[PDB]
């Protein structure tokens, strides 16, 4: 595909950062969205 | 000049290091935390600690005592907290430190003004002889602070509790480049090799801060909130998930964080509600933080009347991401008892 297709349809890690301090606000890995 | 970035690293690493422990536990479950929230609590805990037990805290948080002096650490922490608790006009971000002490305890006045000044903490006198009313009184603080988002932090409060340390963090922001809601549409997410779950998938086609590093074996997206924050997501190539986790390092993040180059793509990502609610005890054990939790704990820093100890170190966070941004929150709950 063009532009190329990037789907988050699978387990992925992520995180949040505050820019000023660059400190790691929260960090996660999403294995099943429906498990809450 | 500043203090934060002198520690920012040490946080960073800790966090990753912490994560890697949680991963080892289940490969089957969501993970969410607030590396900050967990970490500042233990730090202003260490304030009242002496010898081996103080040392394993500061150290277990990835701080190398030879290299960086103690007093500087907190000077550090003092700053980071101030800085966070500034008003971004578009973004809202808060934290709070609370002490709840029983009425009988006489503290080391020093330690008190220490947490009052360095971690700008708040001080509450309570009666731990009304366990259900004490329990409430705390859960409101956290409810107030995380604006409702966390409400049952303390599930079982111990009958002999001599004091508790609590801290919360709250985050509400908006994308720069918010999804359009007409677009969102249910797709499959392939959890496992045989589990497939239907999810609301938000969509845009457009110019994103995205790339792929063969190093990490992943795609990477950065997603700015309006204000002084940003989200990063990492989609590992098939089979490369565990790899991804192993390679992640604070200086690598910083690389990404300098880059502001846009590429065009067709982005699909879920809308999300998860939580994480953890008993940190074994985990910080692996990370070599044992002694506080034991009969060898030293909290002479806090009071002289009796030998206390940490019995419970309990954290919970919640995250929601949608087309309009993210709301996210966490809190840490620490209870101390006599021997
Ligand atoms: C978390 O980590 C896990 C690893 O710890 C990851 O899961 C593991 O992933 C593989 C993925 O393929 C799974 O295996 C599948 O088994 C299917 C058949 O099941 C029977 O046979 C296999 C052995 O052949 C066995 O593992 C099963 O448990 C079951 O048989 C049992 O076997 C034991 C031991 O002999 C016996 O005593 C029991 O009597 C017997 N029966 C019962 C009822 O218990 C296969 O059909 C699957 O094949 C597909 O997938 C392959 C991989 O791509 C592919 O090559 C094939 O061509 C085909 O497409 C597959 O082999 C594992 O069971 C699973 N767990 C473990 C412990 O290994 C998991 O993905 C990960 N999750 C994350 C990261 O989120
Ligand atoms: C402070 O940090 C330094 C750098 O990581 C540590 O020193 C290195 O440690 C490894 C493992 O012991 C040694 O093989 C290296 O030779 C050390 N480098 C130097 C220059 O000596 C150090 O151990 C940490 N401080 C403490 C007290 O543990
Ligand atoms: C994110 O933080 C920055 C600091 O990096 C904030 O900017 C400062 O804001 C005050 C007014 O609130 C000004 O007096 C300063 O001059 C600003 N800059 C600096 C370098 O201190 C900013 O408001 C924050 N949010 C946004 C949306 O920019």
Short mmCIF file of C-alpha atoms and ligand atoms in Angstrom, two decimals:
data_model
loop_
_atom_site.label_atom_id
_atom_site.label_comp_id
_atom_site.label_asym_id
_atom_site.label_seq_id
_atom_site.Cartn_x
_atom_site.Cartn_y
_atom_site.Cartn_z
CA UNK A 1 0.00 0.00 0.00
CA UNK A 2 0.95 3.67 -0.65
CA UNK A 3 1.39 5.40 1.79
CA UNK A 4 2.34 2.32 3.71
CA UNK A 5 0.08 0.76 6.13
CA UNK A 6 1.00 0.53 9.74
CA UNK A 7 -1.50 -1.16 11.92
CA UNK A 8 -1.25 -1.53 15.65
CA UNK A 9 -3.28 -4.63 15.54
CA UNK A 10 -1.04 -6.53 17.94
CA UNK A 11 0.66 -6.30 21.29
CA UNK A 12 2.71 -3.22 21.59
CA UNK A 13 4.52 -1.35 24.28
CA UNK A 14 4.39 2.41 24.62
CA UNK A 15 5.10 5.28 26.98
CA UNK A 16 4.58 8.82 27.97
CA UNK A 17 7.13 11.43 28.54
CA UNK A 18 7.11 14.93 29.80
CA UNK A 19 9.20 17.05 27.36
CA UNK A 20 10.76 19.59 29.79
CA UNK A 21 12.31 16.99 32.05
CA UNK A 22 12.19 14.05 29.74
CA UNK A 23 10.94 11.97 32.60
CA UNK A 24 9.06 8.77 32.03
CA UNK A 25 5.52 9.57 33.10
CA UNK A 26 3.86 6.24 32.51
CA UNK A 27 4.84 3.08 30.74
CA UNK A 28 2.68 0.31 29.39
CA UNK A 29 2.34 -2.82 27.25
CA UNK A 30 -1.09 -3.55 25.71
CA UNK A 31 -1.70 -7.29 25.37
CA UNK A 32 -5.44 -7.36 25.29
CA UNK A 33 -7.47 -4.20 25.25
CA UNK A 34 -10.63 -6.04 26.39
CA UNK A 35 -9.16 -7.32 29.52
CA UNK A 36 -9.65 -4.47 31.88
CA UNK B 1 22.23 23.83 35.08
CA UNK B 2 19.19 21.73 36.20
CA UNK B 3 18.75 18.98 38.54
CA UNK B 4 16.12 16.83 36.82
CA UNK B 5 18.18 15.75 33.95
CA UNK B 6 20.79 14.71 36.43
CA UNK B 7 18.29 12.08 37.68
CA UNK B 8 16.06 11.66 34.60
CA UNK B 9 18.31 8.92 33.42
CA UNK B 10 18.29 7.09 36.64
CA UNK B 11 14.52 7.08 36.59
CA UNK B 12 14.43 6.04 33.03
CA UNK B 13 16.57 3.07 33.60
CA UNK B 14 14.87 2.07 36.71
CA UNK B 15 11.61 2.13 34.94
CA UNK B 16 12.77 -0.06 32.18
CA UNK B 17 14.36 -2.23 34.63
CA UNK B 18 11.18 -2.49 36.56
CA UNK B 19 9.18 -3.20 33.51
CA UNK B 20 11.38 -6.13 32.56
CA UNK B 21 10.43 -7.72 35.89
CA UNK B 22 6.73 -7.27 35.33
CA UNK B 23 7.09 -8.76 31.89
CA UNK B 24 8.75 -11.82 33.28
CA UNK B 25 5.64 -12.42 35.34
CA UNK B 26 2.98 -12.96 32.68
CA UNK B 27 3.39 -12.82 29.06
CA UNK B 28 -0.34 -12.70 28.91
CA UNK B 29 -1.54 -9.51 30.45
CA UNK B 30 -1.56 -5.75 30.13
CA UNK B 31 0.87 -3.65 31.95
CA UNK B 32 0.52 -0.14 33.01
CA UNK B 33 2.46 1.92 35.54
CA UNK B 34 3.74 5.21 36.59
CA UNK B 35 7.40 4.93 37.05
CA UNK B 36 7.34 8.36 38.55
CA UNK B 37 4.67 7.67 41.05
CA UNK B 38 6.33 4.54 42.28
CA UNK B 39 9.60 6.17 42.38
CA UNK B 40 9.12 9.40 44.20
CA UNK B 41 7.35 7.59 47.03
CA UNK B 42 10.21 5.37 47.77
CA UNK B 43 12.44 8.28 47.59
CA UNK B 44 10.78 10.34 50.10
CA UNK B 45 10.51 7.21 52.01
CA UNK B 46 14.27 6.83 52.12
CA UNK B 47 14.40 10.11 53.99
CA UNK B 48 13.83 8.31 57.26
CA UNK B 49 16.02 5.41 56.63
CA UNK B 50 19.46 4.65 57.88
CA UNK B 51 22.27 2.18 56.72
CA UNK B 52 21.80 -0.94 54.65
CA UNK B 53 18.07 -0.28 54.28
CA UNK B 54 18.31 3.29 53.00
CA UNK B 55 21.08 2.26 50.71
CA UNK B 56 19.18 -0.54 48.97
CA UNK B 57 16.35 1.91 48.23
CA UNK B 58 18.28 4.69 46.56
CA UNK B 59 20.42 2.14 44.87
CA UNK B 60 17.61 -0.21 43.75
CA UNK B 61 16.16 2.87 42.01
CA UNK B 62 19.32 2.80 39.80
CA UNK B 63 21.19 5.62 41.69
CA UNK B 64 25.00 5.13 42.09
CA UNK B 65 25.89 6.73 45.40
CA UNK B 66 29.60 7.21 44.84
CA UNK B 67 28.98 9.06 41.68
CA UNK B 68 26.12 11.18 42.90
CA UNK B 69 25.73 12.38 46.48
CA UNK B 70 22.57 11.70 48.47
CA UNK B 71 21.56 15.27 49.24
CA UNK B 72 21.66 16.05 45.54
CA UNK B 73 19.25 13.28 44.74
CA UNK B 74 16.46 14.92 46.59
CA UNK B 75 17.51 18.33 45.41
CA UNK B 76 16.85 16.71 42.12
CA UNK B 77 13.60 15.32 43.05
CA UNK B 78 12.50 18.57 44.52
CA UNK B 79 12.96 20.23 41.17
CA UNK B 80 11.31 17.57 38.96
CA UNK B 81 8.19 17.78 41.10
CA UNK B 82 8.01 21.57 40.99
CA UNK B 83 8.46 21.52 37.31
CA UNK B 84 5.76 18.99 36.79
CA UNK B 85 3.36 20.84 38.98
CA UNK B 86 3.58 23.87 36.71
CA UNK B 87 0.51 24.94 34.74
CA UNK B 88 0.67 23.98 31.19
CA UNK B 89 -2.16 25.97 29.72
CA UNK B 90 -3.31 23.28 27.40
CA UNK B 91 -2.16 20.24 29.26
CA UNK B 92 -3.12 19.29 32.78
CA UNK B 93 -0.58 17.46 34.96
CA UNK B 94 -0.46 17.16 38.83
CA UNK B 95 1.15 15.06 41.59
CA UNK B 96 0.85 14.97 45.37
CA UNK B 97 2.62 13.51 48.38
CA UNK B 98 0.71 12.69 51.53
CA UNK B 99 1.66 11.47 54.91
CA UNK B 100 -0.98 9.98 57.20
CA UNK B 101 0.20 9.42 60.74
CA UNK B 102 -1.42 8.06 63.86
CA UNK B 103 -2.15 10.52 66.70
CA UNK B 104 0.23 8.80 69.27
CA UNK B 105 3.52 8.94 67.00
CA UNK B 106 6.13 11.55 67.73
CA UNK B 107 8.32 12.02 64.80
CA UNK B 108 11.76 13.16 64.07
CA UNK B 109 10.84 16.79 63.43
CA UNK B 110 13.72 16.97 60.95
CA UNK B 111 12.29 14.20 58.73
CA UNK B 112 9.05 15.98 58.84
CA UNK B 113 10.26 19.31 57.56
CA UNK B 114 12.36 17.35 55.21
CA UNK B 115 9.38 15.86 53.38
CA UNK B 116 7.56 19.07 53.79
CA UNK B 117 10.17 21.06 51.89
CA UNK B 118 11.87 18.72 49.48
CA UNK B 119 8.85 16.75 48.32
CA UNK B 120 6.37 19.45 49.25
CA UNK B 121 4.39 16.72 51.06
CA UNK B 122 1.16 17.14 53.03
CA UNK B 123 0.57 16.07 56.61
CA UNK B 124 -2.44 14.38 58.12
CA UNK B 125 -3.10 13.11 61.62
CA UNK B 126 -5.37 10.10 61.84
CA UNK B 127 -6.57 7.41 64.20
CA UNK B 128 -5.65 3.95 62.90
CA UNK B 129 -8.05 2.51 65.42
CA UNK B 130 -10.92 3.28 63.15
CA UNK B 131 -9.64 1.14 60.29
CA UNK B 132 -12.71 1.62 58.05
CA UNK B 133 -12.74 5.42 58.62
CA UNK B 134 -9.03 5.77 58.18
CA UNK B 135 -9.27 3.67 55.04
CA UNK B 136 -11.91 6.04 53.68
CA UNK B 137 -10.02 9.09 54.54
CA UNK B 138 -7.11 8.11 52.47
CA UNK B 139 -9.15 6.82 49.57
CA UNK B 140 -10.68 10.14 49.22
CA UNK B 141 -7.36 11.93 49.00
CA UNK B 142 -6.39 9.79 46.05
CA UNK B 143 -9.89 10.10 44.65
CA UNK B 144 -9.71 13.86 44.92
CA UNK B 145 -6.23 14.05 43.49
CA UNK B 146 -6.66 11.69 40.58
CA UNK B 147 -10.03 13.37 40.00
CA UNK B 148 -12.07 10.29 40.43
CA UNK B 149 -9.96 8.10 38.22
CA UNK B 150 -8.57 5.98 40.99
CA UNK B 151 -10.94 5.13 43.78
CA UNK B 152 -10.11 1.91 45.60
CA UNK B 153 -6.44 2.12 46.14
CA UNK B 154 -6.41 0.78 49.61
CA UNK B 155 -8.37 -2.46 49.74
CA UNK B 156 -7.23 -3.83 53.03
CA UNK B 157 -5.71 -1.56 55.65
CA UNK B 158 -3.90 -3.26 58.46
CA UNK B 159 -5.43 -2.89 61.98
CA UNK B 160 -1.91 -1.77 63.57
CA UNK B 161 -0.89 0.73 61.00
CA UNK B 162 1.37 3.33 62.40
CA UNK B 163 1.52 5.39 59.25
CA UNK B 164 1.06 5.55 55.50
CA UNK B 165 2.79 7.34 52.63
CA UNK B 166 0.70 8.01 49.57
CA UNK B 167 1.37 9.71 46.30
CA UNK B 168 -0.73 10.29 43.22
CA UNK B 169 -0.24 11.55 39.64
CA UNK B 170 -2.85 12.77 37.17
CA UNK B 171 -2.57 13.40 33.39
CA UNK B 172 -5.08 14.83 30.99
CA UNK B 173 -4.00 15.83 27.49
CA UNK B 174 -5.05 16.19 23.85
CA UNK B 175 -3.31 15.26 20.65
CA UNK B 176 -2.03 17.80 18.27
CA UNK B 177 -3.38 15.82 15.45
CA UNK B 178 -6.55 14.41 16.86
CA UNK B 179 -8.42 11.59 15.20
CA UNK B 180 -11.72 12.12 13.53
CA UNK B 181 -14.42 10.09 15.05
CA UNK B 182 -16.40 9.31 11.92
CA UNK B 183 -13.39 7.23 11.05
CA UNK B 184 -13.21 4.90 14.00
CA UNK B 185 -14.35 1.47 13.09
CA UNK B 186 -14.12 -1.96 14.59
CA UNK B 187 -11.27 -4.26 13.46
CA UNK B 188 -9.43 -7.34 14.79
CA UNK B 189 -6.53 -7.33 17.23
CA UNK B 190 -4.49 -10.46 17.29
CA UNK B 191 -3.61 -10.93 20.89
CA UNK B 192 -2.20 -14.30 20.90
CA UNK B 193 -1.59 -16.76 18.23
CA UNK B 194 -5.23 -17.97 18.60
CA UNK B 195 -7.03 -15.17 20.29
CA UNK B 196 -8.70 -12.50 18.23
CA UNK B 197 -10.55 -9.64 19.79
CA UNK B 198 -12.71 -6.98 18.12
CA UNK B 199 -11.64 -3.47 18.92
CA UNK B 200 -12.57 0.10 18.03
CA UNK B 201 -9.75 1.10 15.64
CA UNK B 202 -9.19 4.86 15.14
CA UNK B 203 -7.75 5.99 11.82
CA UNK B 204 -6.03 8.84 9.98
CA UNK B 205 -3.99 9.01 6.89
CA UNK B 206 -1.52 11.82 7.05
CA UNK B 207 1.74 13.13 8.07
CA UNK B 208 3.14 11.36 11.18
CA UNK B 209 6.40 11.29 13.14
CA UNK B 210 6.87 7.72 12.37
CA UNK B 211 9.76 5.57 11.34
CA UNK B 212 11.20 2.07 11.56
CA UNK B 213 14.57 1.13 13.27
CA UNK B 214 16.09 -2.24 12.30
CA UNK B 215 17.88 -1.98 15.63
CA UNK B 216 14.70 -2.25 17.66
CA UNK B 217 13.12 -4.33 14.92
CA UNK B 218 10.01 -2.05 15.12
CA UNK B 219 7.90 0.69 13.89
CA UNK B 220 7.83 3.74 16.14
CA UNK B 221 5.35 6.53 16.38
CA UNK B 222 5.62 9.74 18.33
CA UNK B 223 2.46 11.61 19.10
CA UNK B 224 2.61 15.03 20.61
CA UNK B 225 0.08 16.34 23.00
CA UNK B 226 -0.58 20.02 22.98
CA UNK B 227 1.86 21.23 25.61
CA UNK B 228 5.05 19.88 27.09
CA UNK B 229 4.43 16.09 26.65
CA UNK B 230 4.46 13.30 24.01
CA UNK B 231 3.36 9.73 23.47
CA UNK B 232 5.64 7.11 21.92
CA UNK B 233 4.43 3.74 20.65
CA UNK B 234 6.52 0.86 19.56
CA UNK B 235 5.15 -1.87 17.23
CA UNK B 236 7.49 -4.80 17.18
CA UNK B 237 8.06 -6.89 14.07
CA UNK B 238 6.60 -10.31 14.23
CA UNK B 239 8.46 -12.43 16.74
CA UNK B 240 10.58 -9.51 17.85
CA UNK B 241 8.55 -8.51 20.86
CA UNK B 242 10.80 -9.75 23.51
CA UNK B 243 13.73 -8.33 21.70
CA UNK B 244 12.10 -4.91 21.66
CA UNK B 245 11.81 -4.90 25.38
CA UNK B 246 15.38 -5.82 25.83
CA UNK B 247 16.81 -3.17 23.68
CA UNK B 248 14.97 -0.18 25.05
CA UNK B 249 17.27 2.43 26.70
CA UNK B 250 16.90 5.95 27.81
CA UNK B 251 19.41 7.46 25.38
CA UNK B 252 17.62 5.74 22.49
CA UNK B 253 14.36 7.42 23.53
CA UNK B 254 16.19 10.70 23.55
CA UNK B 255 17.32 10.18 20.03
CA UNK B 256 13.80 9.73 18.90
CA UNK B 257 12.87 12.68 20.92
CA UNK B 258 15.07 15.02 19.02
CA UNK B 259 13.75 13.97 15.69
CA UNK B 260 10.91 15.92 14.28
CA UNK B 261 10.78 14.47 10.75
CA UNK B 262 7.44 13.59 9.29
CA UNK B 263 6.64 10.79 6.88
CA UNK B 264 3.27 9.91 5.32
CA UNK B 265 1.33 6.80 6.32
CA UNK B 266 -2.02 5.14 7.01
CA UNK B 267 -2.20 4.80 10.74
CA UNK B 268 -4.57 2.43 12.62
CA UNK B 269 -4.54 2.34 16.46
CA UNK B 270 -6.95 1.07 19.12
CA UNK B 271 -8.89 3.01 21.59
CA UNK B 272 -8.03 1.89 25.03
CA UNK B 273 -8.99 1.35 28.63
CA UNK B 274 -6.74 -0.67 30.73
CA UNK B 275 -5.63 -0.67 34.35
CA UNK B 276 -2.76 -2.19 36.28
CA UNK B 277 -2.88 -2.88 40.04
CA UNK B 278 0.21 -4.34 41.58
CA UNK B 279 1.75 -5.66 44.73
CA UNK B 280 5.18 -4.42 44.37
CA UNK B 281 6.72 -6.39 47.04
CA UNK B 282 8.31 -9.41 45.34
CA UNK B 283 9.14 -7.28 42.41
CA UNK B 284 11.21 -4.71 44.20
CA UNK B 285 12.69 -7.76 45.85
CA UNK B 286 14.14 -8.83 42.55
CA UNK B 287 15.33 -5.37 42.10
CA UNK B 288 17.13 -5.88 45.46
CA UNK B 289 14.86 -3.88 47.83
CA UNK B 290 14.37 -6.35 50.62
CA UNK B 291 15.45 -4.95 53.88
CA UNK B 292 12.73 -2.31 54.46
CA UNK B 293 10.21 -4.97 53.98
CA UNK B 294 11.77 -7.05 56.69
CA UNK B 295 12.72 -7.43 60.37
CA UNK B 296 15.93 -5.71 59.49
CA UNK B 297 14.29 -2.48 58.40
CA UNK B 298 15.56 0.78 59.90
CA UNK B 299 13.22 3.70 60.03
CA UNK B 300 14.80 5.38 63.01
CA UNK B 301 14.52 8.31 60.70
CA UNK B 302 10.89 8.52 61.24
CA UNK B 303 10.45 7.74 64.84
CA UNK B 304 12.31 6.58 67.87
CA UNK B 305 9.33 4.99 69.75
CA UNK B 306 9.44 1.77 67.91
CA UNK B 307 10.93 -0.24 65.12
CA UNK B 308 8.58 -0.04 62.22
CA UNK B 309 8.54 -1.84 58.82
CA UNK B 310 6.98 -1.72 55.38
CA UNK B 311 4.28 -4.35 55.07
CA UNK B 312 2.50 -3.23 51.89
CA UNK B 313 3.78 -1.39 48.79
CA UNK B 314 0.92 -1.17 46.42
CA UNK B 315 0.50 0.69 43.14
CA UNK B 316 -2.38 1.02 40.63
CA UNK B 317 -2.72 3.02 37.39
CA UNK B 318 -5.38 3.59 34.71
CA UNK B 319 -5.15 4.86 31.16
CA UNK B 320 -7.59 5.87 28.56
CA UNK B 321 -6.66 6.92 25.03
CA UNK B 322 -9.18 7.99 22.42
CA UNK B 323 -9.50 10.20 19.39
CA UNK B 324 -9.16 13.27 21.49
CA UNK B 325 -6.13 12.48 23.58
CA UNK B 326 -5.31 10.69 26.70
CA UNK B 327 -6.39 10.60 30.29
CA UNK B 328 -4.12 8.65 32.60
CA UNK B 329 -3.54 8.32 36.44
CA UNK B 330 -1.58 6.50 39.09
CA UNK B 331 -0.96 6.22 42.86
CA UNK B 332 1.31 4.58 45.31
CA UNK B 333 0.32 3.32 48.75
CA UNK B 334 2.85 2.42 51.42
CA UNK B 335 1.97 1.10 54.92
CA UNK B 336 4.22 0.82 57.90
CA UNK B 337 3.76 -1.20 61.00
CA UNK B 338 5.72 -2.29 64.03
CA UNK B 339 7.64 -5.55 63.90
C1 LIG C 1 3.31 -16.53 25.84
O1 LIG C 1 4.37 -17.50 25.76
C2 LIG C 1 4.02 -18.77 25.20
C3 LIG C 1 5.22 -19.73 25.32
O2 LIG C 1 5.46 -20.04 26.70
C4 LIG C 1 3.48 -18.62 23.75
O3 LIG C 1 2.64 -19.75 23.47
C5 LIG C 1 3.11 -21.02 22.98
O4 LIG C 1 2.94 -20.91 21.57
C6 LIG C 1 2.80 -22.02 20.67
C7 LIG C 1 2.43 -21.23 19.42
O5 LIG C 1 2.32 -22.04 18.26
C8 LIG C 1 1.70 -23.02 21.18
O6 LIG C 1 1.67 -24.29 20.47
C9 LIG C 1 0.60 -24.66 19.58
O7 LIG C 1 0.12 -26.01 19.82
C10 LIG C 1 -0.95 -26.47 18.97
C11 LIG C 1 -1.34 -27.91 19.32
O8 LIG C 1 -1.49 -28.04 20.74
C12 LIG C 1 -1.12 -29.30 21.27
O9 LIG C 1 0.23 -29.58 20.83
C13 LIG C 1 1.35 -28.76 21.24
C14 LIG C 1 2.65 -29.52 20.94
O10 LIG C 1 2.65 -29.96 19.57
C15 LIG C 1 1.27 -28.37 22.75
O11 LIG C 1 2.08 -27.21 23.00
C16 LIG C 1 -0.18 -28.13 23.25
O12 LIG C 1 -0.21 -27.91 24.66
C17 LIG C 1 -1.13 -29.27 22.81
O13 LIG C 1 -0.61 -30.56 23.21
C18 LIG C 1 -0.34 -30.97 24.56
O14 LIG C 1 1.06 -31.35 24.61
C19 LIG C 1 1.59 -31.96 25.80
C20 LIG C 1 3.10 -32.22 25.66
O15 LIG C 1 3.33 -33.24 24.68
C21 LIG C 1 0.80 -33.25 26.14
O16 LIG C 1 1.24 -33.78 27.40
C22 LIG C 1 -0.72 -32.96 26.16
O17 LIG C 1 -1.45 -34.19 26.33
C23 LIG C 1 -1.15 -32.26 24.85
N1 LIG C 1 -2.60 -32.06 24.76
C24 LIG C 1 -3.32 -31.30 25.58
C25 LIG C 1 -4.81 -31.26 25.26
O18 LIG C 1 -2.88 -30.66 26.53
C26 LIG C 1 -0.52 -26.38 17.48
O19 LIG C 1 -1.62 -26.75 16.63
C27 LIG C 1 -0.02 -24.97 17.13
O20 LIG C 1 0.48 -24.92 15.77
C28 LIG C 1 0.45 -23.69 14.99
O21 LIG C 1 1.42 -22.69 15.41
C29 LIG C 1 2.84 -22.90 15.23
C30 LIG C 1 3.70 -21.69 15.64
O22 LIG C 1 3.61 -20.67 14.63
C31 LIG C 1 3.10 -23.24 13.74
O23 LIG C 1 4.48 -23.57 13.55
C32 LIG C 1 2.18 -24.40 13.26
O24 LIG C 1 2.41 -24.66 11.87
C33 LIG C 1 0.69 -24.05 13.50
O25 LIG C 1 0.35 -22.92 12.68
C34 LIG C 1 1.10 -24.58 18.11
O26 LIG C 1 2.22 -25.45 17.93
C35 LIG C 1 2.03 -23.36 22.65
O27 LIG C 1 1.09 -24.30 23.18
C36 LIG C 1 2.12 -22.09 23.54
N2 LIG C 1 2.47 -22.46 24.93
C37 LIG C 1 3.60 -23.05 25.31
C38 LIG C 1 3.75 -23.27 26.81
O28 LIG C 1 4.54 -23.35 24.57
C39 LIG C 1 2.52 -17.41 23.59
O29 LIG C 1 2.34 -17.10 22.21
C40 LIG C 1 2.96 -16.17 24.38
N3 LIG C 1 1.89 -15.16 24.36
C41 LIG C 1 2.10 -13.85 24.17
C42 LIG C 1 3.51 -13.35 23.89
O30 LIG C 1 1.20 -13.02 24.23
C1 LIG C 2 29.26 3.28 40.39
O1 LIG C 2 29.18 3.09 38.97
C2 LIG C 2 30.32 2.54 38.30
C3 LIG C 2 30.10 2.49 36.76
O2 LIG C 2 29.04 1.58 36.46
C4 LIG C 2 30.61 1.14 38.89
O3 LIG C 2 31.94 0.82 38.47
C5 LIG C 2 32.23 -0.18 37.50
O4 LIG C 2 31.69 -1.41 37.99
C6 LIG C 2 31.99 -2.63 37.31
C7 LIG C 2 31.33 -3.78 38.07
O5 LIG C 2 31.84 -3.80 39.41
C8 LIG C 2 33.52 -2.79 37.26
O6 LIG C 2 33.87 -3.96 36.50
C9 LIG C 2 34.21 -1.55 36.67
O7 LIG C 2 35.63 -1.68 36.75
C10 LIG C 2 33.77 -0.30 37.45
N1 LIG C 2 34.38 0.91 36.90
C11 LIG C 2 35.35 1.54 37.54
C12 LIG C 2 35.90 2.78 36.84
O8 LIG C 2 35.83 1.17 38.61
C13 LIG C 2 30.62 1.15 40.44
O9 LIG C 2 30.70 -0.21 40.92
C14 LIG C 2 29.43 1.91 41.08
N2 LIG C 2 29.71 2.15 42.50
C15 LIG C 2 29.50 1.25 43.44
C16 LIG C 2 29.95 1.65 44.84
O10 LIG C 2 29.05 0.12 43.24
C1 LIG C 3 5.35 23.78 29.06
O1 LIG C 3 6.43 24.30 29.84
C2 LIG C 3 7.05 25.52 29.38
C3 LIG C 3 8.46 25.67 29.95
O2 LIG C 3 9.34 24.82 29.19
C4 LIG C 3 6.10 26.70 29.67
O3 LIG C 3 6.68 27.95 29.23
C5 LIG C 3 7.00 29.02 30.16
O4 LIG C 3 5.78 29.65 30.60
C6 LIG C 3 5.79 30.85 31.40
C7 LIG C 3 4.34 31.33 31.57
O5 LIG C 3 3.54 30.25 32.08
C8 LIG C 3 6.67 31.93 30.70
O6 LIG C 3 6.85 33.06 31.57
C9 LIG C 3 8.03 31.36 30.29
O7 LIG C 3 8.81 32.33 29.58
C10 LIG C 3 7.83 30.10 29.43
N1 LIG C 3 9.12 29.55 28.96
C11 LIG C 3 10.13 29.16 29.72
C12 LIG C 3 11.35 28.65 28.96
O8 LIG C 3 10.16 29.19 30.95
C13 LIG C 3 4.81 26.43 28.87
O9 LIG C 3 3.74 27.35 29.23
C14 LIG C 3 4.31 24.95 28.94
N2 LIG C 3 3.16 24.73 28.03
C15 LIG C 3 3.09 25.19 26.78
C16 LIG C 3 1.73 24.98 26.10
O10 LIG C 3 3.98 25.79 26.16
#
